[PDB]
Ligand binder design. Structure first.
Ligand SMILES: Cc1c[nH]c2ncnc(N3CC[C@@H](N)C3)c12
Ligand SMILES: [Mn+2]
Lengths: 316, 10
């Protein structure tokens, strides 16, 4: 029963070219949410229809504590809106930009939760996420990972079943995607490698501003390892970023289970990870439900066509 | 210290 009129618009949080994400209040309940607003015609025009359905079905059919829950989707004459949990601690990209590198423990913790969430998407929803990167990784008020933005998932992928779409983010693409090969859910372990690499190393494993120089580094070069990196972390990054996906950690039939058992994660209890009994190593310092201090000022300091059948959705 | 990146699909 929901329209644009059921909410207060407070701050800008993000802005891609397809849409915007704004911090909202629900008049009727008092609660704050993050609302992703897409202009219907921009989506039709720039070809994003398929993606938008994928996000909507993947948000509705997912229940996991490190995945952004959806409360409503509803549409207007001109907009599509997702009303989702508000992740008050902002992007990882934000934190790693200020701190430069995370400690091993802190990167261990985030990697645990990420692996927990992806295991679930793979094993339970039969979905490969495809676009893991620092921007799609946020924290909630307690300092627990939330994965946001679901439009690049592949649905219906089960076991080692293969797929073709050239997509993701250039800095994060896996060799076998660059190679123009059919690929499988191990791409997500590549992406997890690149993120763990950035957390503990303070930079991307392969960098060039020019995409074709960056794609050549990806297919051709061994990764470099700062001498500050402990042997267990060296080993994990080495295995997550093996270029042949058959040889990659998590690349076999055991999937996430091969990652959980690596000595990097020794003495992390995976059940407690899921149940949220591990202590977040950074608790976001927010004064109120609407304190956007972990969002870039570039956005918060900014002042405020077909029918999609059965887009509309509602959790309770 | 790396510029914000962009999702795409061919
Ligand atoms: C997309 C989204 C869902 N929940 C959110 N909570 C806080 N911020 C979000 N965004 C901030 C900019 C993008 N990283 C997405 C979201
Ligand atoms: Mn780029």
């Amino acid at each position: 029963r929901v329209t644009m009129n059921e909410f207060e618009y407070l701050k800008l949080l993000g802005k891609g070219t397809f849409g915007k994400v704004i911090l909202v209040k629900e008049k009727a309940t008092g609660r704050y949410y993050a609302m992703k607003i897409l202009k219907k015609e921009v989506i039709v025009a720039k070809d994003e229809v398929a993606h938008t359905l994928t996000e909507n079905r993947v948000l509705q059919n997912s229940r996991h504590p490190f995945l952004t829950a959806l409360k409503y989707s509803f549409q207007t004459h001109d907009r599509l809106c997702f009303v989702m949990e508000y992740a008050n601690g902002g992007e990882l990209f934000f934190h790693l930009s200020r701190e430069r590198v995370f400690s091993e423990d802190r990167a261990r913790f985030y990697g645990a939760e990420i692996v927990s969430a992806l295991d679930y998407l793979h094993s339970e929803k039969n979905v490969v996420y495809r676009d893991l990167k620092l921007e799609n990784l946020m924290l909630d008020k307690d300092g627990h990972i939330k994965i946001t933005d679901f439009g690049l998932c592949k649905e219906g992928i089960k076991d080692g079943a293969t797929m073709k779409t050239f997509c993701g983010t250039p800095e994060y693409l896996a060799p076998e995607v660059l190679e123009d090969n059919d690929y499988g859910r191990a791409v997500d372990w590549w992406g997890l490698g690149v993120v763990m690499y950035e957390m503990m190393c303070g930079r991307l494993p392969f960098y060039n501003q020019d995409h074709e120089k960056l794609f050549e580094l990806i297919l051709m070069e061994e990764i470099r390892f700062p001498r500050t990196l402990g042997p267990e972390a060296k080993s994990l990054l080495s295995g997550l970023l093996k270029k042949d996906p058959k040889q990659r950690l998590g690349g076999g039939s055991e999937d996430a289970k091969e990652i959980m058992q690596h000595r990097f994660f020794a003495g992390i209890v995976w059940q407690h990870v899921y149940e949220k009994k591990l202590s977040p190593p950074f608790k976001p310092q927010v004064t109120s439900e609407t304190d956007t201090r972990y969002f870039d000022e570039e956005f918060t300091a900014q002042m405020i066509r077909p029918h999609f059948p059965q887009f509309d959705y509602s959790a309770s | 210290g790396r510029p914000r990146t962009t999702s795409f699909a061919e």
